[PDB]
Amino acid sequence: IVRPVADFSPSLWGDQFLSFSIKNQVAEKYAKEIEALKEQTRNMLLATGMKLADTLNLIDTIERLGISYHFEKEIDDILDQIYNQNSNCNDLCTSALQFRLLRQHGFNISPEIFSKFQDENGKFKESLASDVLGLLNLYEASHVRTHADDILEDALAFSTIHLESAAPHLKSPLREQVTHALEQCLHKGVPRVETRFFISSIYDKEQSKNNVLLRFAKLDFNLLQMLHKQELAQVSRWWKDLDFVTTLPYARDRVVECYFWTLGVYFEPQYSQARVMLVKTISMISIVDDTFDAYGTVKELEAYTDAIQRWDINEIDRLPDYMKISYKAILDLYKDYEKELSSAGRSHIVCHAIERMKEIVRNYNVESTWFIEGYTPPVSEYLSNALATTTYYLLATTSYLGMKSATEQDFEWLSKNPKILEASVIICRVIDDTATYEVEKSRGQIATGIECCMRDYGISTKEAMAKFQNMAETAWKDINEGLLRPTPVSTEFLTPILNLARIIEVTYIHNLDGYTHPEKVLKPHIINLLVDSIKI
Numbered sequence: 001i002v003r004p005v006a007d008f009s010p011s012l013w014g015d016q017f018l019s020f021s022i023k024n025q026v027a028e029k030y031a032k033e034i035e036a037l038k039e040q041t042r043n044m045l046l047a048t049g050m051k052l053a054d055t056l057n058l059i060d061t062i063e064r065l066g067i068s069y070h071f072e073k074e075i076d077d078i079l080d081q082i083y084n085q086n087s088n089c090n091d092l093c094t095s096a097l098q099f100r101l102l103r104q105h106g107f108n109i110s111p112e113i114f115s116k117f118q119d120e121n122g123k124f125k126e127s128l129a130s131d132v133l134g135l136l137n138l139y140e141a142s143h144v145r146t147h148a149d150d151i152l153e154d155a156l157a158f159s160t161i162h163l164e165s166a167a168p169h170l171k172s173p174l175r176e177q178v179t180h181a182l183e184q185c186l187h188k189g190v191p192r193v194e195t196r197f198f199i200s201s202i203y204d205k206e207q208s209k210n211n212v213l214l215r216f217a218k219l220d221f222n223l224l225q226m227l228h229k230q231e232l233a234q235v236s237r238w239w240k241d242l243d244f245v246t247t248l249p250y251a252r253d254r255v256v257e258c259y260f261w262t263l264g265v266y267f268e269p270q271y272s273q274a275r276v277m278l279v280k281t282i283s284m285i286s287i288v289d290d291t292f293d294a295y296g297t298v299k300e301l302e303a304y305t306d307a308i309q310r311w312d313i314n315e316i317d318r319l320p321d322y323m324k325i326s327y328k329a330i331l332d333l334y335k336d337y338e339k340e341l342s343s344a345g346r347s348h349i350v351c352h353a354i355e356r357m358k359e360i361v362r363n364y365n366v367e368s369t370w371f372i373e374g375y376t377p378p379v380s381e382y383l384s385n386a387l388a389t390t391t392y393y394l395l396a397t398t399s400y401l402g403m404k405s406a407t408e409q410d411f412e413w414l415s416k417n418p419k420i421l422e423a424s425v426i427i428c429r430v431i432d433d434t435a436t437y438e439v440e441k442s443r444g445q446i447a448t449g450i451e452c453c454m455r456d457y458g459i460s461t462k463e464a465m466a467k468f469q470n471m472a473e474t475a476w477k478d479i480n481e482g483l484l485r486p487t488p489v490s491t492e493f494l495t496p497i498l499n500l501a502r503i504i505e506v507t508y509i510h511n512l513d514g515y516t517h518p519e520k521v522l523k524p525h526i527i528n529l530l531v532d533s534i535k536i
């Protein structure tokens with residue numbers, strides 16, 4: 001009873017991450033200077049007598065430099081004051097920046113601030129077209145709108161068309177920043193990679209840059225990168241010791257890409273343990289996906305699914321040898337989770353991620369059944385199954401395991417599929433389906449997202465893809481709304497969900513996937529985040 005073909009490619013990375021030894025003297029040097037620079041920066045933020053525009057530009061610069069996580073309380077205190085005071089700036093640049101920064105931090109500033117910039121017909125004054133800084137900040141702000149922000153409904157188009165027109169004659173690095181913005185907006189980018197671009201490509205080249213902030217940003221980035229490299233080394237050894245690339249030769253060898261995903265979810269030092277836990281789940285679920293997608297028979301897949309629901313090592317005899325391997329590994333991983341959380345007294349919350357694993361395996365099996373039967377469900381039924389198979393319910397849940405602050409109440413909220421989680425999952429689903437359609441259409445998939453859509457609504461491939469794009473647009477507004485205070489849980493637990501939506505947009509940018517193993521899209525970001533340090 002034959003199997004498919006060894007179609008996947010090996011890891012292009014070889015063993016270059018397997019061992020990293022931190023030059024402890026260099027790390028301590030960096031850490032010591034950063035401490036001094038951190039305090040100088042804190043004093044900049046706490047300086048009195050600053051004008052609004054200067055204050056917002058300082059916060060914006062520090063956030064783009066990737067060092068705002070050092071100043072969460074200070075920044076919040078300042079934005080909170082700005083929110084509460086009657087800000088009457090009549091310039092497009094400052095208004096739009098004020099709007100963006102406040103909204104991104106959950107402050108529900110009214111979009112009425114943009115009215116003065118529009119005619120009686122609610123359309124932006126074309127006379128703004130010669131204000132590039134205003135256009136740029138309006139552009140960035142337009143990506144943070146909610147359903148209640150229809151005054152901004154054309155801001156994206158307006159600013160885009162005029163930025164395009166102005167870009168080639170702008171000075172550097174403003175030109176590069178505008179051109180980059182048009183390709184990748186700040187709000188929907190992966191924070192470490194926008195940070196890397198801003199530091200090296202923009203701020204390092206800005207005539208007016210603050211030397212203290214630039215040096216701070218460079219040292220902090222490179223020191224954090226050291227931690228990330230230690231983590232990836234530890235994870236690479238863990239993966240190598242599992243030796244799935246030998247025992248399960250049908251499976252993808254992509255632990256570097258999996259680790260990069262965790263880096264998108266959170267990069268800060270306090271989430272080191274969290275990333276190491278998360279990456280192991282991402283690696284293992286890609287094994288499961290592949291087992292379902294191109295190796296297991298119907299009968300094998302049904303026993304696998306059943307064994308997962310029972311979740312007992314006793315069940316392993318009921319499986320073929322090759323499934324025994326991943327099944328034991330899955331059970332071991334969660335017992336490992338329980339042990340490393342027991343000292344903190346948080347072993348009891350591992351069950352929540354276990355339930356999501358059980359869930360996605362059920363839905364994998366449904367997807368297989370559908371495929372075997374040649375079933376094309378209506379979109380509603382399709383999504384009822386296919387949202388879970390994005391892995392995003394599992395990943396979001398898993399992201400909390402290593403977060404010391406995460407409580408049972410936080411897991412209970414997540415367990416109900418709150419709107420902001422649903423939105424992120426939907427974004428991942430429709431982006432994947434748009435990119436996967438043409439290739440999977442030839443692979444025999446009758447139950448692919450776009451096909452379900454085409455058949456349900458009786459529309460073309462283009463119309464279906466536009467309907468899917470609209471779903472993603474709607475979901476981004478939902479995410480944006482879901483960040484607004486008062487939040488149902490602490491914002492610390494929302495940002496992973498937002499960041500999950502960010503990575504998938506970035507990974508499938510410009511279409512499609514992108515193409516052939518999203519590795520090609522990820523490769524330069526992995527180089528920039530995990531191989532090459534920022535030259536100082």
Ligand SMILES: C=C(C)[C@@H]1CC[C@@]2(C1)C(C)=CCC[C@H]2C
Pocket residue numbers: 252254257258261282285286390391507517518519
């Ligand atoms: C979102 C997921 C659960 C994972 C992250 C890495 C992934 C899919 C990618 C994008 C490339 C290698 C294949 C595979 C492992």
Ligand SMILES: [Mg+2]
Pocket residue numbers: 289292293
């Ligand atoms: Mg699959």
Ligand SMILES: [Mg+2]
Pocket residue numbers: 432433436437440
């Ligand atoms: Mg797909």
